Symmetry: C3
Subunit: 264 residues, 3 copies
């Protein structure tokens, strides 16, 4: 851009600073503020009273509700105004009072959110987080700095995830929990600090996983949590199992990324 498409609507009370890019059939509602380094994709709606600023790219067909703050200065004590970034994909529902903060130089400079996510009232995405696709952050859920939340994962209401933790794909974290370590893919976690409670079987079933994939995932879970062996001992057994059941590879990929140890 730096231009507002002729088919975009900008409310007379909104303040869209010169340099902002606004795509076709987007809608900027009353009392919105949009900074000059913001890009808003085709079909995206900011309902009213939304602040979007920083070097922030937002994709298509998003709906962003009142009192949300996107691209804002993060809460890291070292941050000092560096031109860091936020990227948000397509078809996200970003509800009232959601906060998504910009990255830090030290943390890699980017906070990223994928597509088809539901971020419920007052959900918080800290500096340097990566949220994937089709995730749900329930009311008042909070991701601290540098947290990853992989595809399909759900974070229950009033749950806090501690800095640097990885929440694996298809994880379900129960409400009123505090997650202090990494959560392998496909697992249910609950408590404070959260501990594992088996495989997210209902989730996998609903998402079309085969009988064989669910059994294999359960077997990888048992290797980690029931076998009594060390993680070092089970890593090759899991890779071996993944030679037949491709879904089990998700564990191997996760172990490579994990830095905080596993919830146990």
């Amino acid at each position: 851009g730096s231009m507002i498409d002729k088919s975009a609507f900008v409310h007379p009370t909104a303040i869209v600073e010169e340099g902002a890019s606004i795509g076709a059939n987007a809608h900027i509602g009353p009392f919105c503020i949009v900074g000059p380094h913001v890009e808003i994709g085709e079909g995206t709606v900011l309902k009213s009273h939304v602040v979007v600023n920083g070097h922030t790219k937002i994709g298509r067909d998003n709906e962003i509700y009142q009192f949300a703050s996107i691209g804002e200065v993060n809460q890291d004590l070292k941050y000092a105004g560096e031109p860091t970034r936020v990227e948000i994909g397509d078809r996200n529902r970003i509800r009232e009072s959601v906060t998504i903060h910009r990255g830090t130089v030290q943390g890699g400079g980017l906070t990223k959110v994928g597509s088809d996510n539901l971020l419920m009232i007052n959900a918080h995405i800290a500096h340097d987080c990566t949220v994937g696709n089709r995730c749900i952050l329930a009311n008042n859920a909070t991701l601290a700095g540098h947290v990853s939340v992989d595809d399909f994962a759900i974070i229950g209401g009033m749950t806090a995830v501690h800095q640097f933790c990885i929440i694996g794909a298809h994880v379900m974290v129960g409400g009123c929990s505090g997650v202090a370590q990494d959560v392998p893919p496909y697992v249910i976690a609950q408590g404070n600090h959260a501990t594992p409670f088996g495989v997210n079987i209902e989730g996998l079933k609903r998402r079309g996983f085969s009988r064989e994939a669910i059994t294999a995932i359960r077997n990888a879970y048992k290797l980690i949590y029931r076998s009594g062996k060390t993680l070092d001992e089970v890593k090759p057994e899991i890779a071996e199992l993944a030679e037949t059941y491709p879904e089990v590879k998700a564990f191997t990929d996760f172990f490579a990324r994990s830095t905080r140890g596993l919830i146990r």
Copy 2:
């Protein structure tokens, strides 16, 4: 209406859409948005920065504080824009960032709030909830879909009530709790998941319950929780006790509505 009473005040910066009904001596503050299917009763005040929309009826002498969202699209994954409803009674104090969402077709189409309630900062009332009269939802308290909160009940700060649960009349739920089942009237509940901790005796005393009513309620509580009998066994004993002490009937009425089992 669809009209604004001559004695109502609408701030020049507020946006009240044609069709909205606004009663005598009501006050719509700066930067408020009021949709065309909203009705606002006599004496009601929207302080500033309030969004009210949907098919939403609001009674008299309410005070609604900045950054609250009333009548908004709910967070149910099946909701698709159906013209569902919110009803709010009289003399409620609805504090900053409160969210009250509209109902779902599947859930019965109505979210309802009574009168003389205090909804503290960031309290959340989900689709299809029913809050009665003289209730208190403390800071960050969250009601999931289809939750009932009966007269005089108090929900402590940072407490989540799970979908479909019934919180009985005069219940006190402690802070930092997660309520996963139904709570009988007159009971104190605390923890995650919350468990019963006797009768809300101080509450009943302050509200003018007689010595005999408090004793009778304690006896119904003991039948449920101390006697060792099944709920099926105690139901007739409680109804029998209610033949003398009318306040005990609240239990019978509650059992008829309960669907999630009792906190134990």
Copy 3:
């Protein structure tokens, strides 16, 4: 004042009521409301969408983010509109949706916040609280009425502190906690209800405490929590220890103020 300094900026969309005092190089952003009894110090910024009202004094070089409410009517059930007060010092970072409420007549009439504090998203400071200097209240942290939070103390995310409690200097309260009694200075507290978990040693080290001061503080901690003696018995032993190690005096000063008993 009651005047706006010639070097202050007030956005054309802001509503600053006649009588408000606004200092040099202050900045009142779009859609802000500032009441007539507000004083805003030199260099203070209200980003946008901020409500400041009541008899409220705000110092220099503060940054107050969107959707924060400062000076607002408190949530005490007895409050009835009395002209009570808020005082806020210098160089505070007050993040999105923070609420700081005015005092009560019964509680002493003042809510006070010092300098160099970080109040993270949705932090809550109730009527009659006193927050000192260099404190941190993390996301969704909540102080109930009449709570004191002394210098350097940190309150973790989603943590509630109960009414009248004192949190001592250099305390660290972990996330997802509920603090129901007083916390001595220099202590780590965690849980619901929170219990003590030793001295905040890492905090003291980073803040430049000497080897001897840290040892002495640990010895006072052991007197309270390990010795098996009553608090009455240890008070003179702690005062005796403070004759050599001045930092230990913080305990004696704290005991004098404490009213709720100690977390144990």
